[PDB]
Write a protein that holds these residues in place. Structure first.
Motif, mmCIF file in Angstrom:
data_model
loop_
_atom_site.group_PDB
_atom_site.id
_atom_site.type_symbol
_atom_site.label_atom_id
_atom_site.label_comp_id
_atom_site.label_asym_id
_atom_site.label_seq_id
_atom_site.Cartn_x
_atom_site.Cartn_y
_atom_site.Cartn_z
ATOM 1 N N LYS A 62 -11.968 47.267 39.003
ATOM 2 C CA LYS A 62 -11.269 47.228 37.726
ATOM 3 C C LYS A 62 -10.106 46.229 37.800
ATOM 4 O O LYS A 62 -9.900 45.436 36.886
ATOM 5 N N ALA A 63 -9.376 46.259 38.910
ATOM 6 C CA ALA A 63 -8.246 45.353 39.132
ATOM 7 C C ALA A 63 -8.703 43.911 39.143
ATOM 8 O O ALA A 63 -8.102 43.051 38.499
ATOM 9 N N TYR A 64 -9.779 43.653 39.872
ATOM 10 C CA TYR A 64 -10.340 42.329 39.967
ATOM 11 C C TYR A 64 -10.679 41.752 38.586
ATOM 12 O O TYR A 64 -10.342 40.605 38.292
ATOM 13 N N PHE A 65 -11.338 42.538 37.741
ATOM 14 C CA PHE A 65 -11.782 42.031 36.442
ATOM 15 C C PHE A 65 -10.673 41.997 35.399
ATOM 16 O O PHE A 65 -10.852 41.424 34.328
ATOM 17 N N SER A 66 -9.529 42.601 35.693
ATOM 18 C CA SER A 66 -8.415 42.532 34.763
ATOM 19 C C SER A 66 -7.238 41.726 35.317
ATOM 20 O O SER A 66 -6.135 41.822 34.812
ATOM 21 N N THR A 67 -7.485 40.926 36.346
ATOM 22 C CA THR A 67 -6.444 40.078 36.923
ATOM 23 C C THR A 67 -6.771 38.628 36.603
ATOM 24 O O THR A 67 -7.925 38.220 36.697
ATOM 25 N N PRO A 68 -5.762 37.840 36.204
ATOM 26 C CA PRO A 68 -6.049 36.438 35.897
ATOM 27 C C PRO A 68 -6.697 35.732 37.078
ATOM 28 O O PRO A 68 -6.334 35.990 38.219
ATOM 29 N N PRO A 69 -7.645 34.840 36.805
ATOM 30 C CA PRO A 69 -8.386 34.175 37.880
ATOM 31 C C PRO A 69 -7.522 33.490 38.937
ATOM 32 O O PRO A 69 -7.921 33.489 40.095
ATOM 33 N N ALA A 70 -6.391 32.904 38.563
ATOM 34 C CA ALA A 70 -5.558 32.206 39.535
ATOM 35 C C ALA A 70 -5.133 33.134 40.679
ATOM 36 O O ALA A 70 -4.926 32.690 41.805
ATOM 37 N N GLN A 71 -5.005 34.422 40.379
ATOM 38 C CA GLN A 71 -4.445 35.384 41.324
ATOM 39 C C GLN A 71 -5.452 36.340 41.961
ATOM 40 O O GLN A 71 -5.138 36.982 42.960
ATOM 41 N N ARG A 72 -6.644 36.455 41.383
ATOM 42 C CA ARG A 72 -7.616 37.459 41.833
ATOM 43 C C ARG A 72 -7.831 37.529 43.333
ATOM 44 O O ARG A 72 -7.703 38.590 43.936
ATOM 45 N N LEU A 73 -8.196 36.408 43.932
ATOM 46 C CA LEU A 73 -8.586 36.420 45.331
ATOM 47 C C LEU A 73 -7.388 36.693 46.224
ATOM 48 O O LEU A 73 -7.495 37.429 47.202
ATOM 49 N N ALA A 74 -6.236 36.137 45.862
ATOM 50 C CA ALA A 74 -5.019 36.339 46.639
ATOM 51 C C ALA A 74 -4.624 37.803 46.627
ATOM 52 O O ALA A 74 -4.317 38.387 47.664
ATOM 53 N N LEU A 75 -4.639 38.392 45.438
ATOM 54 C CA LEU A 75 -4.040 39.701 45.207
ATOM 55 C C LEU A 75 -4.830 40.813 45.839
ATOM 56 O O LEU A 75 -4.285 41.863 46.172
ATOM 57 N N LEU A 76 -6.127 40.594 45.975
ATOM 58 C CA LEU A 76 -7.001 41.629 46.474
ATOM 59 C C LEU A 76 -7.381 41.311 47.918
ATOM 60 O O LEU A 76 -8.050 42.092 48.583
ATOM 61 N N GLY A 77 -6.904 40.171 48.407
ATOM 62 C CA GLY A 77 -7.139 39.775 49.780
ATOM 63 C C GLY A 77 -8.619 39.622 50.062
ATOM 64 O O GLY A 77 -9.028 39.472 51.211
#
Length: 234
Positions: free
Chosen positions: A219-234
């Motif tokens: 859910k977090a992944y699909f509601s996080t802006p693309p610029a930050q997705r990979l960083a934020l979820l490691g």
């Protein structure tokens, strides 16, 4: 001459362990319902498979893919992952001519103008609820978009692709209607309003109570802006 059940099994052997589901249909069932602009340019009896991702796709396919050597920058990672697995379907049926939507070895139009929700509906996979399914609806001028609902996962799934098998024609493939799992007018109203008017709200996806939902991480992944997705979820 290959049978649909045997092909379906081989495609499922390829895709189901990675969180996908596959549903056969005749090209005719899809075209019949639409203006020619959106048709698949094939003979009606042609065999096709509608491919969906379930909540499991994220853990079984995407996360592994994101840690793999196949990932590239500058294009959506989910699209990459899907194209990779549809590619694996091609490899697993080397003796057959297989077309894929979307085909990323084609770039411009016309890639076909597929109406994915209609494909999911005629394949019996998920009922495509639309405004017309509410009699005397209260929305007047607004643009009310429709949404497909899966009987097991509610709205916690996505339509991902179509596999076409030109030259394999299955004129006697028996159709199955999608499960009308949101049958009442009041529930269809709540579904369509949740979908079109509710924000940070996943609730429309529970219009039928699902057996499983996206995890909090997904859910977090699909509601996080693309610029930050990979960083934020490691």
């Amino acid at each position: 001459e290959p049978k649909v059940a045997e092909l379906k099994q081989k495609i499922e052997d390829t895709l189901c362990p990675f969180g996908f589901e596959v549903y056969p249909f005749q090209v005719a069932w899809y075209n019949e319902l639409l203006p020619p602009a959106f048709h698949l340019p094939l003979p009606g009896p042609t065999l096709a498979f509608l491919v969906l991702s379930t909540p499991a796709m994220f853990d079984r396919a995407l996360k592994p893919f994101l840690q793999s050597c196949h990932l590239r920058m500058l294009t959506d990672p989910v699209d990459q992952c899907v194209a990779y697995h549809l590619g694996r379907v091609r490899e697993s049926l080397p003796e057959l001519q297989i077309e894929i939507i979307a085909d990323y070895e084609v770039h411009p139009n016309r890639r076909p103008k597929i109406l994915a929700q209609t494909a999911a509906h005629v394949a019996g996979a998920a009922y495509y609820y639309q405004r017309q399914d509410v009699e005397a609806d209260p929305w007047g001028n607004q643009r009310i978009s429709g949404v497909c609902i899966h009987p097991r996962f509610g709205g916690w799934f996505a339509i991902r692709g179509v596999v076409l098998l030109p030259g394999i024609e299955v004129p006697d493939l028996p159709p199955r209607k999608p499960h009308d799992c949101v049958p009442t007018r009041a529930d269809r109203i709540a579904l369509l309003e949740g979908f079109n008017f509710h924000w940070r709200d996943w609730t429309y996806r529970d219009a039928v109570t699902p057996q499983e939902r996206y995890s909090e991480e997904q859910k977090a992944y699909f509601s996080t802006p693309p610029a930050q997705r990979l960083a934020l979820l490691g």
